[PDB]
Every structure is written in C-alpha cells, then in structure tokens.
C-alpha cells in the first residue's frame, strides 16, 4: 500500500494543527498546544488508490528536532499554510519555500499554497496576492477553513496528486 509523506509548514497560529486534526479526526479544535509537533497517519482512498498519509504537523520552527530535519529531507510534499487575516504569515511563506528548496536542491518540489481561516471576516491577504504568489512558484493555491472544513480534503488530496505528478 502506497504511503505519501506530507509536511505541514507555516507560521505559528495559521491553522496547521487545526487543518491536520480536521483531516484525521473530523472535528475543529479551538486550542491545540502550539508547541506539539508530531506525526499522524490516515488511510484514505484518492482516485481509487487506497493509501496511507504520513503527516508531520510542524510546530517549533528553527529549533531543530531530528524528526523535523528527517521529514524535511524525506517528506515528499509540503502544505505551505498562511492565514488570510495574518499578513505576516503570508510574507513568511517565502522563507518556508526557501527552506524546502534548499533541502531538496530543487525548485520542483510537490507543494500546495494554503490560505486558511477563510471563514473569518475582513481578510488582510487578498485572493489575488495568494494566486500571484502560487503562480510565481508554479503550485496550486487552495483556500481553506479548518473551522468549517471547507477545502481541507481538497488541500491534502491535491498535494497527493502533486506528489504523483512529480
């Protein structure tokens, strides 16, 4: 049975754990320790292939743990998440994408740009800033809400599709 090794990256606070917990447990968690970094496993059928996702929900960025360095080096695809009401999280995407590029000595790494918290009012990052950035990197952009679950499956399934394509 095929396994897809996925890494969820992005600023503290943007919804990486909430998105992961939606996928795994189908509920929205309001507070999940922002310091917990761990891996989760989910068996799913995507385009008629029963597969296993092995997902690292990252937490303590730049404080090097041997589990993160390994998923960094061995991860096959990356969800790069910012929050649409957090300008700074969106500006930070560059740094994450740069860390991914450096570790893979490649600009062709399976990646999806995720704009989360779509359910929130008066976003500060316009859809157009997100589309232009994903167009520049050559990757899909998917808007999500961990709260309502909109886009959550589509983000992870599209990443799996990007791994296949690569």
List interacting residues with Mg ion (CB under 5 A): 17, 59
Rounded CA separation 60/13 (Å): 12
Residue 119 binding ligand GDP, by CB under 6 A? yes
17 vs 116, beta carbon nearer Mg ion: 17
18: which DSSP letter?
Answer: H
Residue 165 CB, nearest approach to ligand GDP (Å): 26
Q: Which of 55, 100, 134, 146 binds ligand GDP (CB under 6 A)?
A: 146
Instruction: Give the number of residues in contact with ligand GDP, rule: CB under 6 A.
Output: 19
C-alpha–C-alpha distance, residues 135 and 8, integer Å: 20
Name residues contacting ligand GDP, limited to 28-67 (CB under 6 A): 30-32, 34
Q: Which does 153 bind (CB under 5 to 8 A by kind): Mg ion, ligand GDP, none?
A: none
Residue 90, judged by CB atoms within 10 A of its CB (0-12, 13-18, 19+), counts as buried
Q: What burial class does residue 45 get, using C-beta atoms within 10 Å of its C-beta: 0-12 exposed, 13-18 middle, 19+ buried?
A: exposed
Catalog residues that contact ligand GDP under the rule CB under 6 A. 10, 12-18, 30-32, 34, 116-117, 119-120, 145-147
């Amino acid at each position: 049975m095929t396994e897809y090794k996925l890494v969820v990256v992005g600023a503290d606070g943007v919804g990486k754990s909430a998105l992961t917990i939606q996928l795994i447990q189908n509920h929205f968690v309001d507070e999940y320790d922002p310091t917990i970094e761990d891996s989760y496993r989910k068996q799913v059928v995507i385009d008629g292939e029963t597969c296993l996702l092995d997902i690292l929900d990252t937490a303590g960025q730049e404080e090097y743990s041997a589990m993160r360095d390994q998923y960094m080096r061995t991860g096959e695809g990356f969800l790069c998440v910012f929050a649409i009401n957090n300008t700074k999280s969106f500006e930070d995407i560059h740094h994450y994408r740069e860390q991914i590029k450096r570790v893979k000595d490649s600009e062709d790494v399976p990646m999806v740009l995720v704009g989360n918290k779509s359910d929130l009012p008066s976003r500060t990052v316009d859809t157009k800033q997100a589309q232009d950035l994903a167009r520049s990197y050559g990757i899909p952009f998917i808007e999500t809400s961990a709260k309502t679950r909109q886009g959550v499956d589509d983000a992870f399934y599209t990443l799996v599709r990007e791994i296949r394509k690569h």
